[PDB]
Amino acid sequence: MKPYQRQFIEFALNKQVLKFGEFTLKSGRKSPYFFNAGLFNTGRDLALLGRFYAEALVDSGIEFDLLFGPAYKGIPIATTTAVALAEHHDKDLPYCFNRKAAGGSLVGSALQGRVMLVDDVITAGTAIRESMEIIQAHGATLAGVLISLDRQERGRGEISAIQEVERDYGCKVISIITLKDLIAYLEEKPDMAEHLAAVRAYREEFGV
Amino acid sequence: MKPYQRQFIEFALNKQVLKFGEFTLKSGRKSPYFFNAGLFNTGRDLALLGRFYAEALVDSGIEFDLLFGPAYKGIPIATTTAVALAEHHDKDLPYCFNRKAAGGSLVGSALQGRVMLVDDVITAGTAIRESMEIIQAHGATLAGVLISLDRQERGRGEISAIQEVERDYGCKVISIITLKDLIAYLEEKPDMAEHLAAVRAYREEFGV
Ligand SMILES: O=C(O)c1cc(=O)[nH]c(=O)n1[C@@H]1O[C@H](COP(=O)(O)O)[C@@H](O)[C@H]1O
Ligand SMILES: O=C(O)c1cc(=O)[nH]c(=O)n1[C@@H]1O[C@H](COP(=O)(O)O)[C@@H](O)[C@H]1O
């Protein structure tokens, strides 16, 4: 666990973006925890959020030339990560995004070179295959996918979605927290035991 | 002319977002200058851009509860203005935006209370009437419209678009530069004389 990961969880908790209960995923499973980046609905949330993203980006070491935000749910993030990156790390990079309009119609820079794709959480090895249609549809390569939370569980097969993503676009997914950190984290909060025993239990059944 | 307006022009120039030549507006007129916020395609541009917006916001004194970014061209701005506002002024505000999808489907906070709408440049007393459909379609009032550049010229009538906007949504449009500052600015650059005599000439024919 690296520090920014520690405050992220925290950041994430207080926000309630990270919640402990009894959810029912889009898959039909019944996870004990849910992560919902949508609850980042304010300036500061956005401000911080992009501070975490830039770190994991930076602290990753992958190389990329350009940020890319998918659809709608990508725009606020790619914009914030872009500002974090220049205010905070002195990295000046070009962002753009795609117009989901009855076409590609990118908004912002080129779509030239090594795209770094950015999003919130992959569950269903999804829009990436749309998103990544564009990138590959304009003669730019894909460098990777930066996300918030790797739920680290099984899909319909033995592997996970992230894994499938790595396994299909010859790309590398980076990400801020993972299940593992999530647990690691609960081990320090003695009074999160109930959530622990539970997420501990869960990863057993489904953890990849 | 207030300082941030001075660096904005500058910022705007070096960027070439502000260009001096011979354009032909969407109206059919032949302006001597063009402003094209689209050339803000990088992290820093976005970073700065939202620093200017927050100022004019702040330095305005209007009150609002929430930021609002229209369509696509609004998302990167409302996101940046939101971060500026919290990093820089300690104003924590809730942003959201609208999903242009075959509906309202806002993305982010409420659409509750006093919206502050944010955009790049109004020319054709436009999407505001779409944008402002939403706001008024959800029981939020409109506090205003914050923009970059008031071109300060005539529409089909004696008044300008901004004026018509004020004149139709009982709202107040704020904005960073105006033609006037634009000129004021050229008066200090002795070797911008040609652009001066020209934009001076232009405002005469069309200036409101
Ligand atoms: O249902 C889940 O898989 C899910 C787990 C989780 O930990 N977080 C989470 O965001 N999700 C869902 O993942 C969605 C976004 O991801 P994609 O299918 O990759 O677009 C959602 O509708 C979330 O609710
Ligand atoms: O054609 C113009 O009116 C125009 C003048 C100008 O100074 N800046 C400018 O952005 N425009 C146009 O205004 C558009 C965006 O404004 P709305 O019609 O309010 O959406 C554009 O397509 C610009 O090119």
Check CB contact under 8 Å for A108 and B76.
yes
Within 10 Å of residue A121's Cβ, how many Cβ atoms? Answer: 17
| Alpha carbon of A59 to ligand 1 centroid (Å) | 25
Q: Which DSSP symbol is given to A40?
A: -
Q: How far is B206 from chain A (nearest CA, A)?
A: 32
Closest C-alpha to ligand 2, atom 3: B123
Q: Which amino acid is at B133?
A: E
Q: How far is A175 from chain B (nearest CA, A)?
A: 20
| Token code pair at residue A44 | 């500061």
Q: Which DSSP symbol is given to A89?
A: S
Q: Which amino acid is at A95?
A: Y
Please count the structural domains in chain A: 1
Q: Which of B1, B4, B114, B112 is nearest to B53 (CA)?
A: B4
Nearest CA in chain A to B51: A83
Domain boundaries, position A76: 1-208
Q: Are B24 and B104 in contact (CB under 8 A)?
A: no
Please give the Cα distance from A158 to B20 (Å, whole number).
61
Q: Are B89 and B54 in contact (CB under 8 A)?
A: yes
| Token code pair at residue A146 | 């930066």
* CA A121 to ligand 1: nearest atom: 16
Check if A126 has its Cβ closer than 6 Å to any atom of ligand 1.
yes
Strand partners for B34: B19
Q: Which of B145, B104, B156 is nearest to B122 (CA)?
A: B145
> How far from chain centre, in Å, is Cα B202?
21
A98 three-state secondary structure:
strand
- Strands B95-98 and A113-118, by their bridges, are unpaired
Q: Which of A204, A202, A181 is nearest to A33 (CA)?
A: A202
- DSSP of A104-138, one letter per residue? --EEES---EEEEEE-S--SSS-THHHHHHHHHHT
Nearest CA in chain B to A86: B44
* Contact residues for B43 (Cβ-Cβ < 8 A; gap 6+): A67, A82, A83, A85, A86, A91, A92, A93, A94, A95
Discontinuities after residues in chain A (C–N over 2.5 A):
102
* Residues of chain A found within 8 Å of residue B93, distances taken between Cβ atoms: 42-43
Q: Which amino acid is at A77?
A: I
> How far from chain centre, in Å, is Cα A150?
7
Q: Are B189 and B17 in contact (CB under 8 A)?
A: no
Q: Under the phi-then-psi rule, with left for phi > 0, alpha for psi from -120 to 50, and beta for the rest, what region is A170?
A: left
| Token code pair at residue A175 | 């990400």
* Contact residues for B186 (Cβ-Cβ < 8 A; gap 6+): B192, B193, B195, B196, B199
CA A28 vs CA A25, A156, A200, B119, B167: distances in Å: 5, 11, 19, 41, 53
| Token code pair at residue B101 | 């999808």
What is the CATH classification number for the domain harbouring A192?
A: 3.40.50.2020
Q: Sign of the C-alpha dihedral, residues A126, A99, A175, A142?
A: positive
Q: Which of B160, B94, B161 is nearest to B127 (CA)?
A: B161
Q: Which amino acid is at B183?
A: I
Pocket test residue of B26, B131, B176, B177 for ligand 2, highest count of atoms within 8 A of CB: B26
CA A79 vs CA A108, A196, B67, B122: distances in Å: 11, 35, 15, 22
Please give the Cα distance from A110 to A203 (Å, whole number).
41
Check CB contact under 8 Å for A46 and B83.
yes
Q: Which of B93, B163, B91 is nearest to B128 (CA)?
A: B163
Q: What resolution, expressed in A, was reported for this entry? A: 2.6
Q: Are B141 and B112 in contact (CB under 8 A)?
A: no
CA A5 vs CA A2, A179, B125: distances in Å: 6, 12, 46
Phi first, then psi: what are they for B9, rounded to 5°? -55, -50
| Alpha carbon of B121 to ligand 2 centroid (Å) | 6
Check CB contact under 8 Å for A96 and B41.
yes
Q: Specify the DSSP element, H or E, that contains B177.
A: strand B172-178
Please give the Cα distance from B100 to A17 (Å, whole number).
25
Please give the Cα distance from A157 to A164 (Å, whole number).
10
Q: Which amino acid is at B163?
A: Q
* Residues of chain B found within 8 Å of residue A67, distances taken between Cβ atoms: 43
A94 three-state secondary structure:
strand
Residues recorded for chain A = 208
Please give the Cα distance from A96 to A81 (Å, whole number).
12
Q: Are A142 and A113 in contact (CB under 8 A)?
A: no
Interface test with A, best of B17, B39, B40, B46 (most A CBs within 10 A): B46
Q: Are A119 and A74 in contact (CB under 8 A)?
A: yes
Q: Are A196 and A187 in contact (CB under 8 A)?
A: yes
Please give the Cα distance from B69 to B57 (Å, whole number).
14
| Token code pair at residue B16 | 């070439």
